[PDB]
Structures are given as C-alpha cells and as structure tokens.
Amino acid sequence: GLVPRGSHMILTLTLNPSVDISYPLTALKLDDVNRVQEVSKTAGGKGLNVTRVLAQVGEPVLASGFIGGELGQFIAKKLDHADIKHAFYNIKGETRNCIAILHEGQQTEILEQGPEIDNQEAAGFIKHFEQLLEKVEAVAISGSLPKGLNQDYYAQIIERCQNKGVPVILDCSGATLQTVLENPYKPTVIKPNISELYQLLNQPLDESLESLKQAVSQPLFEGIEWIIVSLGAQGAFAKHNHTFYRVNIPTISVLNPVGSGDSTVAGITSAILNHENDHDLLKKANTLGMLNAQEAQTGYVNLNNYDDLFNQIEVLEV
Amino acid sequence: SHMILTLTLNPSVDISYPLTALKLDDVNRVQEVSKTAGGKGLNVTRVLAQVGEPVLASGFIGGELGQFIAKKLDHADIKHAFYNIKGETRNCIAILHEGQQTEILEQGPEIDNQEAAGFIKHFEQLLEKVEAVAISGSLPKGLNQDYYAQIIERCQNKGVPVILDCSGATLQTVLENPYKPTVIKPNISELYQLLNQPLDESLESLKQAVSQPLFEGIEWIIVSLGAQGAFAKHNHTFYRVNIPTISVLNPVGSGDSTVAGITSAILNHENDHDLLKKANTLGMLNAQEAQTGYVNLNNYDDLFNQIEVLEV
C-alpha cells in the first residue's frame, strides 16, 4: 500500500501540550517524603488524546501546536514511538509539566501555566499552519490558549480554515469558546455539554427538549453547522443546520470519564473527514465517548467493543 | 589536575511548586515554577563554584531530562563530564504549601552492567585530571552494592582523596571494605546507628565510638553535634568545633555545603583548624539561606573568625 500524497488527513492542534507525570500513591504524606517507583510520564494535552484515539480508529492524522525545550523533545520522542506523525512549531520557551497525584481515592493535580509564546512565534505558527492546511481536510482544535497569544488566535486559525473550506471541530470552553462564538469565523462543530451551554447564554439549566431547541438556536451559536450537546447518561442533543436530534445511548459501566470528550472529538472529526451521514456521525461520536469512559486509560478505546454499543444507539429527528 | 571531581550518581530534575494552599483532590494552578539540576553532589558543585574552586561534575544522566541537567549546568558555566545511560533521569517534586514541604521522590532509572563498567572506565580517565573526589548520595537502582568501594579503589590507586557523604547501608558497605574514603561526615545520631549503639553525647563515648574497628583507616571523621558545633577525629587527634549563633531558615543541603568546604580545604592543603572552621562556616551559611546548596560569602569572614577550634 502506497503512502498517500493528497489532503485526506486530520490535523489536530494542541497549542499547550504538557509532559504529564502520574504518581500512583498508596498514601500522600503531606509535609514528608513520598517515595515512588512506578511513575508514568506521557505526552499530554487534549489534542494529543484526540490524535491517539484517531490513530486507534485508523484515520490519517498529523499533530501540531507549539513545543519547546527538552520537554518538547520528550513529547516528540513519545509520538515517534507511537508512530504518530507531528509537525510542531519550535519555540524559545519550554513545554510545561503537569502533575497528577493518584492517592487514597483522589486525583491531586498541579497544572503549570507553561511557556509564553512571543510575537514572531505566534505569527510564524500561523504561516506554518497555513502550509499544513494544504494537505488537510479537517482540523480538530482542543484546549485553551498558551500565554502570550492574542485572545483572537483561534479565530485567526478558523479564518484560515474557512477560506480553504476545511471544517473545524472546536473543543474549548469558557471565555475561549465564547471569543470564537462572537467572532465572524465559525467552527463547523462545537460540543458543549448541557451546563456549559446555558452558562454561555447566562440562563438557568433546562433539560426540556423545547428549551434546548431554543438555547442552541440563539444568536451566540449562529453559523455553526453542528452543535452536539451531552446530556450525560441520557445520551445527547444535537442541532445540524436546522435539524434536531435526540441521541439515545444504553446504560454503561464507566471507570474513568476523562478523555471521553477527547474521544468524542475524535469520533466527530473522523466522521467529518469521511462525510458520514448525521446518524452515523452521532453514533460514532457517542460510541467512542462511551468506550473511553469504560477504560481505565485516558483517551483510549477498545475497538472490539465498538460495534455492540453502536448497535444500541438510537437517533431521533425531534 | 588542580580540580575537584564531584560525583552525583543519581541526580534529578527537581521541580518546586510554591502554593498558597495545596488543595487535594482538586486542580492547583501554578505560574512560578522552579526547575533545577538536583542532587546532593550538584549542590556541592554549586557551592564549590561559588567559592571559586575548579570543579567538574560527573555521574549518570539519561534522555531528555539528562540533557536538561547538562543545559542548566552550561548556563551556570559549570563544567560536567557525565556518563549517559539508556534510562531517563528522574524528576523529584517539592510542594511548598502553608509552611510545609511535601516531597515526591522517584526511584529513577536502572543502570545495567555495561553502563556500570562503562562509567568505571570513564571515571578512571577523569581521575587523571583531578586532585580530590567528593561523593554524595546513594546508588541508583541496578548497581552492584560494591560500586562506591570500586570507585574508591580507583582513587586510592591514584592517591586522590575521597570525601564521602553517604549514609546508612550505603556508607556501611564502604566502611567494611579495604579501600577507604579520606573523609567521612556522619552526624552524631548516625555515628551510633552505625555501631548499633545507643546515642551517647558523652565526649569519651564519642572518642571511643570514633575509634572503633568500623571506622579504621579513615583519616578525617567529622561529626556534627547540631548547634553545639562539631566533634572530629584526624588520625589520633581529636578536635571540638565551637560555633556561633545563627537563625536557621532552611537546614537542607547544609551537609552539601560542609562537603564542599571539607573538599576545598583538602584541595588547597589547608591546615586542620582551617578545614574544620571552613567546613562549619559553609554549613552555617547555607543554613541561613533559603536556597538549598547556596552560601552568602559576605558573612563568611565574620562567621569564620567567631569559630574557635579546641584539641580535646
């Protein structure tokens, strides 16, 4: 089989990756020495969890964003080992660490701000991104902006995509998302869960179908092709153009839900790339999300459990 | 060859997280993070570089975190000649939160037999360009227990003095072997732990303890007594070090500074009074500092002059 020369590929963006350090502890002794033998150190960031799920699904994918220093080199080594292709922009600063302490039933995290991106690097990445766009049919953007970047930076990136007709799946939240929602350059897919959605509008939460319909049809969400809203265990609600869907998912036994959002993003972006119909797009997004939740690993899916759950998902035009 | 070799067989990339509160089971966001080349022998090195002493750092490093260490040393203009390994140099974490130091220490990499013998050959060639060796810390995972004895054998052959700063079962393996460090520095509690003897602060018990067959063939034995000062044995002579008063802000790495002081004195063939004061002045200087393995040498002279040394 020949190595492809065209544009049939996903680009993931992880603008603030980290070297995640995991410390499983039987107890965290505060104000003392905690000795540990089994530390796991990985290439972290939501965009990289998306990339990993896409590689499992078998989709062509290229990871980019900003890396720097020895820790950026460590990130690169890790992706190389996993046979994951990447084209990160090198910066003068150093990629961050993030700590997760797994102890006594608890995840105690320490999250580093990370490097400052200067002006030449911010501009140069845009030129880099533009080059990468020539060989790409979809772009998945995950996580918040590193320090030093203009708060319109995703809007700039989305604008480059829209000109070339390359669809954007945006997974970011808070002010970051809101900044994009208020700008003229629209992502193709956004995916806030039900509380996030109403918070964005500054309205009380309401699970009623009619109320979710009005919420997603509001001015804030104008021009976004897909809005895909998680209602939790009771599946999802989605709006495609002006068509509404209730996605009904089966009861599952979950273990670790972190990275289900990342897995959903991989499923959406895979379905986009492939031009899957609405039902298929929705079923894939929710299956990957559910499979990951069933795993102890973050941004990992067991593909031999995919088809049985997929067959249990029901999509209704509502 | 007028140079000190420091040995840091198990260094770390130390990460330091100063927090207002450590919120457990929650996200703690941090902005001001300090990442440094860590390990006792590197503290010795930094203190020796402060004093202006010719120094070269060696030991094992691996992967990207090993390169971070080299880079940090390069920036500090500290010379190094490490031996690279297939494993990764470890991280060590310190969370400083509401008066507490909560530490996470990784075991670190395993060293294989080719790497262990590789370092021995590398160390022997380094030994041709140095006049004193300071050894700090314990053995990384995978190394034969005899490894320090092997290193010291090489130094003894070459007539190069070894200042040994290591503890517990690690030090005990050395004491029982034929090839001797020139200087050891166990504290008083540690001294009696070695003999499996009850802790006695008595001077005669101390003279006896330091003269027991476990410590035979060791030139300098320097025992910290706390604020009191020190008790030391040089060949057959016994000294007592009378040290002034200071406020201790951070007493971590005070031993490192004392090793740097003992080792500098050995390099420059200083007399016995001058060595004990210098060992003690650097140790106190560091105890006054917030920075681990750091001394303010402005206060050196006055603190040095307030030190008396008595043969007892």
Q: Which domain holds residue A259?
A: 1-318
Q: Do A34 and B104 touch (CB under 8 A)?
A: yes
Q: Kindly determine whether residue B102 and residue A77, on different chains, have CB atoms separated by under 8 Å.
A: no
Sign of the Cα torsion B11, B291, B52, B255 reads negative
Query: Amino acid identity, residue B274?
Result: D
Distance CA A290, CA B175 (A): 60
Total number of residues shown for chain B: 312
Task: Name the DSSP letter for residue B109.
Answer: P
Map B131-192 to HEC letters: CEEEEECCCCCCCCCCHHHHHHHHHHHCCCCEEEECCHHHHHHHHCCCCCCCEECCCHHHHH
Tell me B294's DSSP state: -
Choose among A254, A15, A255: nearest CA to A121. A15
Residues in CB range of A103: below 8 A, 6 or more apart: A23, A24, A25, A26, A27, A28
- The Cα B63–Cα A123 span in angstroms is 31
Backbone angles phi, psi at B100, to 5 degrees: -110, 150
Are the C-beta atoms of B231 and B202 separated by less than 8 Å?
no
Q: Can you tell me the distance from the alpha carbon of A96 to that of B85, in angstroms, rounded to the nearest whole number?
A: 24
Tokens at residue A207, please?
């699970």
Tokens (6 digits) for B24: 């457990």
Q: Are B56 and B5 in contact (CB under 8 A)?
A: yes
3-class SS at B123? helix
Beta bridge partners, B12, equal: B38, B90
Q: Taking CB atoms and an 8 Å cutoff, what residues of chain B touch A113?
A: 29-31, 33
Are B85 and B6 a contacting pair, CB within 8 Å?
no
Catalytic option among A80, A83, A262, A278:
A262
The dihedral sign for the CA sequence A74, A77, A82, A84:
positive
- Contact call for residues A27 and A103 (beta carbons, < 8 A): yes
CA A57 to chain centre: 15
Element spanning B279, H or E: helix B272-287
Which position has the token pair 């390359």? A166
- Residue A70: closest CA among chain B residues belongs to which residue? B64
With CB atoms and an 8 Å threshold, state whether A110 touches B95.
yes
CA angle (B233, B238, B244) in 5-degree steps = 95
Q: How many CB atoms lie within 10 A of CB A210?
A: 9
Q: Which residue of B has its CA nearest to A71?
A: B64
Determine the Cα–Cα distance for residues A138 and A140; give it in Å rounded to an integer: 7
Half-sphere exposure of A158 (CA within 13 A, CB side): 25
Q: Distances from the Cα of B69 to the Cαs of B43, B66, B88, in angstroms?
A: 13, 5, 12
Two tokens, residue A215 = 């919420």
* Those residues with Cβ within 8 angstroms of residue B304's Cβ, 6 or more apart along the chain or in another chain: B277, B278, B281
Q: DSSP assignment of chain A, as one string? A: -PPP-SS--EEEEESS-EEEEEEEES---TTSEEEES--EEEEESHHHHHHHHHHHHT--EEEEEEE-HHHHHHHHHHHHHTT--B-PEE-SS-PEEEEEEEETTEEEEEEE--PPP-HHHHHHHHHHHHHHHTT-SEEEEESPPPTTS-TTHHHHHHHHHHHHT--EEEE--HHHHHHHHHSSS--SEE---HHHHHHHHT------HHHHHHHHTSGGGTT-SEEEEE-TTS-EEEEETTEEEEEE------S--TTHHHHHHHHHHHHHHTT--HHHHHHHHHHHHHHHHTSSSTT---GGGHHHHHTT-EEEE-
Distance CA(B248)–CA(B283), nearest Å, equals 11
CA A16: distance to chain centroid?
12
In A, minimum Cα distance to B34 occurs at A112
Contact A245, A238 (CB under 8 A): yes
Q: Which helix (H) or strand (E) holds B6?
A: strand B4-8
B27 and A109 in contact by Cβ < 8 A? Answer: yes
Q: How many other C-beta atoms lie within 10 A of the C-beta of residue B310?
A: 11
* Domain CATH code at residue B41: 3.40.1190.20
Running DSSP on this structure, what letter comes out for residue B98?
T
Rounded CA separation B254/B70 (Å): 24
H and E: helices and strands count for chain B: 10, 16
Give the number of other Cβ atoms within 10 Å of residue B4's Cβ.
Answer: 25
Burial class of residue A156 (count of CB atoms within 10 Å of its CB; 0-12, 13-18, 19+): middle
Neighbouring-strand partners of residue B62: B85
Q: Identify whether the C-beta of residue B172 lies closer than 8 Å to the C-beta of residue B139.
A: no
Nearest to A110 among B30, B63, B67 (CB): B30
- Token pair belonging to A46: 């939501």
What are A219's two structure tokens?
Answer: 């001015």
CA distance A57 to A52: 9
Question: Tokens 């750092």, residue?
Answer: B57
CA dist A207 and A21 (Å) reads 38
In sequence order, what are the residues at sequence separation of 6 or more whose Cβ sits closer than 8 angstroms to the Cβ of residue B186?
B167, B171, B194, B221, B223
Asked how this structure was determined, the answer is X-ray
Sign (positive or negative) of CA dihedral B239, B240, B246, B250 = positive
Pairing type for strands A243-248 and A314-317 reads antiparallel
**Residue B126 CB: number of other CB atoms within 10 A?**
19
H or E segment and range at residue B242: strand B237-242
> Hey, are the CB atoms on B93 and A112 less than 8 Å from each other?
no
How far is residue A101's CA from residue B277's CA, in Å, rounded to a whole number? 44
How many domains does chain B fold into?
A: 1
Question: In a 10 Å sphere around its CB, with 0-12 CB exposed, 13-18 middle and 19+ buried, how is residue A8 labelled?
Answer: middle
CB A255 within 8 Å of CB A294: yes
Count of alpha carbons within 13 angstroms of residue B249, beta-carbon side = 10
**Cα separations in angstroms, A153 against A10, A264, A305:** 20, 24, 38
Q: Could you give the count of Cα atoms lying within 13 Å of A242 in the half-sphere of its Cβ?
A: 2
Residue A228 in tokens: 């895909």
Q: Which residues contact A131 (CB under 8 A, 6 or more apart)?
A: none
Q: Could you tell me where the beta strands, DSSP code E, fall in B26-152?
A: 27-30, 34-38, 55-62, 79-80, 83-85, 90-97, 100-106, 132-136
User: Is the Cβ pair A74, B63 closer than 8 Å?
Assistant: yes
Please give the Cα distance from B86 to B101 (Å, whole number): 32
Cα–Cα dist A142/B55, whole Å? 47
Instruction: Report chain A residues touching chain B, CB-CB < 8 A.
Output: 21, 23, 25, 28-37, 39, 41, 69-71, 73-74, 77, 97, 99, 101, 105-113
CB-CB: which of B24, B31, B103 is closest to A113?
B31
Residues with their C more than 2.5 Å from the N of the next written residue in chain B, i.e. before a break, are none
- State the first-to-last Cα distance of chain B, in angstroms, to the nearest integer: 36
Chain B residue at shortest CA distance from A116: B31
Chain A residues in contact with B65 by the CB 8 A cut-off are 70, 74
Nearest Cα to Cα of residue B296 among B276, B312, B281, B311: B281
- How close A101 comes to chain B (CA, Å)? 9
Tally of CB atoms within 10 A around A167: 19
The residues, any chain, with a CB within 8 Å of residue A202's CB and separated by 6 or more, are none
Cα A202 to the center of its chain, rounded Å = 24
Structural resolution in Å: 2.3
Cα Dmax for chain B = 59
Q: Measured between CA atoms, how close is A236 to chain B, in angstroms?
A: 27
Nearest to B14 by CA among B96, B81, B84, B87: B96
**CA angle, residues A223, A229, A231, in degrees to nearest 5:** 160
Q: What is the CA radius of gyration of chain B?
A: 19
Whether residue A65 contacts residue A42, with contact meaning beta carbons closer than 8 Å, is answered with no
d(CA A94, CA A291): 34
User: What is the spatial distance between Cα A10 and Cα A12, in angstroms, rounded to a whole number?
Assistant: 6
Contact at 8 Å (CB) between A34 and B102? yes
By the 8 A CB rule, do B89 and B12 touch?
yes
Question: How buried is B113 (Cβ within 10 angstroms: 0-12 exposed, 13-18 middle, 19+ buried)?
Answer: exposed
If you compute the radius of gyration of chain A from its CA atoms, what whole number of angstroms results?
20
Q: Which residues of B are catalytic?
A: 256
Rounded Cα gap, residues A92 and A108, in angstroms: 30
Q: In what order do the strands lie in the sheet with A106-112?
A: A40-44, A18-25, A96-103, A106-112, B27-30
**Yes or no, beta carbons of B27 and A77 under 8 Å apart:** no
DSSP letter at B214 equals G
Chain center to CA of A47: 5
